[model samples]
Target chain A: LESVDKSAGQVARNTGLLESQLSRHDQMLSVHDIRLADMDLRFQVLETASYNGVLIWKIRDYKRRKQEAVMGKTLSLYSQPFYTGYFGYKMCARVYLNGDGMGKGTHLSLFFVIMRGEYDALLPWPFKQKVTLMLMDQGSSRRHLGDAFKPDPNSSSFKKPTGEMNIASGCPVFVAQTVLENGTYIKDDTIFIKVIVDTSDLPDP
Target chain B: KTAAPVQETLHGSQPVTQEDG
Candidate 1:
């Protein structure tokens, strides 16, 4: 009876340990899945690139989103364009369709946000770089109205993300949404944006 | 010090007639 009791104890202990290991692996798997999605998004970005990895935003249903903005509601839309910065740190862009107000009530605001990743330790704190946002003038030769800004070294948006993302860092008055349908900025209720990360400031590791 | 004031610039690809997004 003593021997049987010892065997049962050992079995329970091993089972508990194995269960914990399995749970840990499950957590790892989710991380792996997120990384895989990142890979796929980057692949799509490259496949659609017409300007050598310069990310583009092609808004198909512009009218719908515009209506939402016209209602005086603040809106922010996020898209992953800053993938694997030359430094291999993943980043994203958030475009506020309506105004960020602060006296920017008439235009779409463009911002950049840093996302925490596995390589956060290797990245420089308080990221500073030139971000250029171009609003394409479809159906015309006068294409590419652009805005560029240098991030503040001390702004909350420029700080390293402690959570899912740091605050948005970019131009609050990117461009006015009212001009989107003027046949210069928008055509057929659609708009396009081109982003260039002037990594000229950051160097290869 | 908090931070050197950030520099923000706006440029139009074309001549501006009038605007606001």
Candidate 2:
């Protein structure tokens, strides 16, 4: 992550490497966040505790004309998050929830890569490493509270463990509400709102 | 604030309130 890089025409680099990735250690410093289709591609900058343990954002059901609650949560005391996204080519997240025991710390919800932007994304990032949640600065990211509405059977080749969640070695399966990709109307359904919060520590605003 | 200030309100009181069947 020496500087911003880009991938073009070369058949998008493999998941572990993106031509545009900035620094290998780039994502660890996210202070803001935004989503790819996250309501206008607008970066939302959440204030540390301007809210509380739980926060919710609307996924915008324009046809329904109601703000659909996309995500929310209570901060995790442990690093085992439940969801993950944005690998291959993404770096940085706005510091939504500050990190634990920090001069600087950050957290991610439902597992996520910090930056969803094409330019700043990085791969081969601290893989299999516990990630620190980041705080979002207004300019760097969009503030979008999120929750996972599409899960791949809780066990699929489609998903992997990330900072927002860590899948334990062995766990029982149960049928409950989960994210899924079914039917044809929206075939590509990996998209989900990330619930970013932390109980590790709080920042003094 | 609770309508009955002494009691914690889990939700609004609706005499005809119903639950998912």
Candidate 3:
């Protein structure tokens, strides 16, 4: 009977401990959910707040991301969406670290994406803005890998989207993967890409 | 030996939602 009493006491203690742990876990989950919601809100603000038509994308974890790309785990990465104006064209950039299309196995492919914007009705269709893409030189050598393109008005890629995003179009061979490693473009396991849409030439809508 | 592989969420392909509107 004494042993039985002792076992029951132990079980009661364990039950109390488990209840306490469960309560802590519940609290943690609540905090995590709040944080995630806050992050999402901030991300939305960042995505649509750009008025300047320029996006500077900072990509970290270069080596691991490259490995993932090489292993076919993550073939492409997208940058945060930016806008030509607060109520202007929504756009983003996509990168193929291991290359894409004809650039496969030789270059790092980069493309510009036209996303459906909230103010699409107010903006001009068949995006004609000139675009410049650059892989920044983090080192003092400062020789950036740059390319530019004038949008093909005839292509569906520049048309007003019927979907979330219109087709992406840009340099398939933005830079040779070999040049990326040999140059100052990457530093401290991070790379920066800059995209500029020439709003200077656009006439008032 | 390397550490065990961890499953990670890849970036850049999130669906565009209109919730912000």
Please report the candidate that would top lDDT against the real structure. Answer: 3
Clash number for each model: 6, 53, 0
Candidate 1 CA-lDDT value: 0.63
Give residue A26's lDDT in candidate 3 (0 to 100): 85
Clashing pairs in 3: none
lDDT of 1 by residue, A1-205 (tens): 7787978888887888888889997898889988888899879776653333356777767667756555644355666545544444456666666656442457677766667766676777766666677777677576576776666686666676677776555666666656655455667767677777676645556
The top-ranked prediction according to DockQ is 1
Q: Residue A121 lDDT in model 3?
A: 70
| Model 1 misplaced regions, further than 4 Å | A1-53, A72-74, A84-87, A103-105, B1-21
Query: In CAPRI terms, where does candidate 1 land?
Result: incorrect
Cα displacement (Å) at residue A84, model 2: 21
- Model 3 RMSD in Å is 10.8
The segments of candidate 2 whose C-alpha lies over 4 angstroms from its true place after superposition are A1-50, A61-179, A183-194, A200-205, B1-21
- Computed on C-alphas against the true complex, the DockQ of each candidate is 0.07, 0.02, 0.02
Ranking by TM-score: 3, 1, 2
Interface RMSD of each: 8.3, 21.4, 17.1
Instruction: Give the fraction of native contacts in model 1.
Output: 0.08
Report lDDT (CA) for all predictions: 0.63, 0.25, 0.75
DockQ of 3: 0.02
Which stretch of 10 consecutive residues in model 3 chain A shows the poorest summed lDDT? A42-51
**Tens-digit lDDT track of model 2 for A90-175:** 22222112111121122222223322223222433222222322222222243422322222232321123243322321111111
